[model samples]
Target: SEPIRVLVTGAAGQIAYSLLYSIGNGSVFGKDQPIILVLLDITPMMGVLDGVLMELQDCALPLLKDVIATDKEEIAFKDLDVAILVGSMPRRDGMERKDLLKANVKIFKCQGAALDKYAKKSVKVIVVGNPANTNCLTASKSAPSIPKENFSCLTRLDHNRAKAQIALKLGVTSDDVKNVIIWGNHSSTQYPDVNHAKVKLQAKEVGVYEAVKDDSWLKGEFITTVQQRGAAVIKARKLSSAMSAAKAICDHVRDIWFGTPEGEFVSMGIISDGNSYGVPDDLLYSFPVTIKDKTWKIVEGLPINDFSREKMDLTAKELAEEKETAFEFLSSA
Candidate 1:
């Protein structure tokens, strides 16, 4: 296969600091694939981004082809295969996630338009900025030419956290857990669904419904913890979530492009039709999917019970409102 051309926007951001190292050193998927990295950021940040690029050069990663930092969209996007949007305004103290959502739209709307105009035929996008799902929806709508399926937002952190919690409870390794999913928005209201997860070393299956079937306290606390995990991190560190966010971006791209191992699935916020649980067809929501042949297909044949149905529906509604909000933002843009 040819080298993958990657564009990383917000190259000066904290998340990009970790992301660059992992990608350059082949710590990501171990593909050992050639990568031409385009680092995009505001022109003023080029100096800082250049310092990072210098490290990439010193690392002498065999897979790394080149690094270019620029604010110019056409220059950044030309012939790119994958673009990861990572830079956005981080909400200050006391700001709601929804406020962050509205602010990021202004940036993504322009970006979506630029990508639509300049990106290559195979360009796939993952929006890792905060309020990612809504920004993703905005971008996909702005770039109608790009297939919506090709654009995804990040929720892999929640998915991984859900896996970790379950693994701790079951006294197993997180790697041993498979098919865990984080559904809906990436914010506090996001739904962490494990209804079809494989546990006990993939021999036994556990679903959120099954876990909650007998224990309401476990169910309620787990859900609350997952929803509020971001705050928990901030409270502990007194900083915005950064390293884990970078890890989520890495895991999302690596798994989506390379496919999860057999008997394993990952969560991805994708374009949705809401047909399964009465979600609007146009809403972009997360689902459990496995990637194969350089594309993603939603895993099917799972039974949805009342609790899952209600939460899924509620999350779907939240996503729809987000889409509508994004659409309105684009209209003004």
Candidate 2:
């Protein structure tokens, strides 16, 4: 009967600029789900966001029912059906790694409390900021009222990257490359496992490893290419991979909302219940998952090979250490 309210942080940034349209046009949430966009940014960026609002007005999307733009968290976070956290304090000149983590935990802490205080209890949240899995952990922890299951971070970018690599090798569209899984942190240490993936080429499904016919390339360059894709984008664009990241966000939430196709899975970073492939308890770890009725269950019983186990555990350990750093900052602050 009414619009679905959604909150997006860092709305003045490049990713949100691309994402807003995707959400506004009814493509992200669907044609039936009219949207009221609640956009948040820092005080300094409000003027820029005013321009963004004016531009949205000119865009004239019918599915965009309304827009609320603000610098105040209380104003922006109130009573949302969804909240996508994309704003984080980035590492600046001379800042240490721990310093960056400290800054992020603090920001997530503030935003998470806003979610707890004002947003819907069932509000679905996604973290798209840098150090995303750990940032998601911080946000979920601070918003204890919200179920940890409702929290997720973007690993779909890596998931899509892995699929694209396989699709390119097979001379097919990414749609043909199905079920590629990204495991652990959203960083270079993350594992893009393609062993269980299949290529639906010419109406016949073929395993990616078998179709590619090059074990060395599949086991070496493919993994690193997917892992380091964000950095490669930065190297090429001199900025973050906003376009693809935005597209991946749309795909991720769409999959969650509409449910994945039968018998297929996508990678997402969610709180580990220790139900996955030896990922530590309570860490935000990426795993292959299938969604139904707006809930995702980690795909269980996928045979993890030695190579996959080593890679998965390495990224799990990285996230565990990152958690320690984030918790240390939280306690000290």
Candidate 3:
């Protein structure tokens, strides 16, 4: 395969700091494949980006074919194969939700237009910025030419958190858990479904819900833990999750690029399009999906009980309101 060009926005940020090393070391793409790294940030971060580039060079990674650091979107996005949008205005102590939405909308709008103008039509984009689902929706609307399916928000972090929590409860490795679906938004209302999840045991796979047999724990503790895990990290460490978020990004891109394992599905926040089970059209929502041959399809026909339905509706409503809040920005762009 030819060299793949990847663009990382907010490249000087903590998450990107952890992400770039893994990407350059071939943790996401195969070690044998070559890649071009494009790092973009504001002019104020140019010095920091330069230091990052220096470290990348110091590592002397064999798979890193070239590195480009720039403040211009057009220059950074040109001919890109993959783009990870990680930069956004952090909500200050007194900022309101509407304020945060308005601030980041402008940044994504310009980026979306730049991507449409400069990147390959087939580029795979993952919006990791806060309010990711809406940010991704805003970006998708800005670039009508790019297929909606090519854009997604990062929900794998929540997905991984759910899996780890379940594994810890069962006294098993996180890798032993599979099919733990994260439904709805990437926020507090996100539903981590364990009904269909399974855990490997004695060389056989068993239902995670069956193995645990504790509905109270699943509904109360597990769900809250996964939803508030990021907050828990911040409260404990006084910093947002960086390394774990970076790992989730790599997992997301790798699954999209090389396909998911057979009979397993992962959570991805994509444009709903009304084709998915009960999800409304035009809203970016998380669904369980499987990938093959570099293409993804929502895993349909899963039964949603009343409990799950209620949770889904709540999150869906939140997302609908979020879309409305940013509608003017999206359309104006």
Candidate 4:
């Protein structure tokens, strides 16, 4: 069988460093599947990327069949099965996140255009750069030829964080927590929905009405804590974020390209029609999803209470506004 080909943009960045190691160790995709890694960076970063490639060579991973490092888009994008966009212009000390969003949109526009022209039919992508959801929306618009569902952003970090918080409060292993959803934006206003989630005990499975009633048992503070935890990380570290973003990147891709274990639903941003949860069609938003046969399916027939609806709508509004902003920039760029 041919090896799974993956493209990693921002190849010399710290997150890329974390990602390369995880992929080699079989944490991103399983160790059983062979992989062909393609690293893409700007001209100045090629030398740094080469150094990273050399270390990967020394690691001599059996699952990694080959590593291609280049500044050329055509070479980097060729036949890629999964593409992860991770590198972005770091926010300066005084810059707002919104400023970073506009700048990154420029980069995403070019990369997205290249993917449309060069990437294979099966390429599934996750945009992990800052303002991730909006960046993903820009990319998806550029690559309209590709299936909309195949392009998404990273919110799995919020999802996993919710699980950890619930686990800690309940004194259980993180693995025991399941069905958590991170709705709306991947940013501060994002909503962590635990309606279908469990806390040391599984909630009753019935209609949406029943799920809302069960929320009392699940503890509401867990959701707010997880949704706002990124700020907490920044506060505690008194520095920028670190390698864990890469781990969340791994969780996002692995669950889609590989498969989520049975009885668990992961948080993912996917193209939505508002049909399932009143979200507008073609708008990208986060929801509980599971993958089978290498394709993602939104877990159907789940409940969304007023609390979830309000939060989801707020985030979706932000997403809609960002999508419009990105498209306008793309038109002129």
> Against the true structure, what is each candidate's TM-score?
0.91, 0.96, 0.96, 0.89
Best by TM-score: 3
**Superposed model 1: Cα runs more than 4 Å off:** 92-101, 201-214
Ranking by TM-score: 3, 2, 1, 4
- For residues 1-333, what per-residue lDDT tens digits would candidate 2 score against the true structure? 368989999899989999998898888888888899988999999999999999987999998889889999888888998999998766333344343445677888888899999999999999998788988999998999999999999999889888888888889999888889888988878888889989987779988888889998988988888877777788899996888989999999999889999879999999898675787799999988999988999999989899999998889888989888888777544
- How much is the lDDT of residue 195 in candidate 4? 66
- The lDDT per prediction is 0.79, 0.88, 0.90, 0.78
In candidate 4, list every pair of residues with a backbone clash. 273-281, 274-279
Q: Kindly give the number of clashing pairs for every candidate.
A: 5, 0, 0, 2
In model 2, where do residues sit more than 4 Å from their true spots?
Answer: 91-101
Residue-pair clash count for candidate 3: 0
Residue 98 in candidate 1, Cα distance off native in Å: 9.0
Please, what are the lDDT tens digits per residue for candidate 4 over residues 1-333?
359888999889877887897887777778687899999888999889899999998998988989889999998878888999987886434355333347688888887888888999678988988788888888887886787888988998887787687667655667766677788778766787766776444543332224345455444566668755777787898654556677888888888866889887888887886458888877777877888876788888886677778878888888888777777677654
> Where does model 4 exceed 4 Å of error?
91-100, 201-221, 238-240
Of candidates 4 and 1, the better by lDDT: 1
TM-score, candidate 1, is: 0.91
Q: 180, model 1: CA deviation in Å? A: 1.4
Write one digit per residue (lDDT tens) for candidate 1, span 35-153: 88889998789899889889889988888867777879998878888999987877544354333337688888888888899898578899988678888888887887778789998
Candidate with the larger TM-score of 1 and 4? 1
Ranking by lDDT: 3, 2, 1, 4
Better of 2 and 3 by TM-score: 3
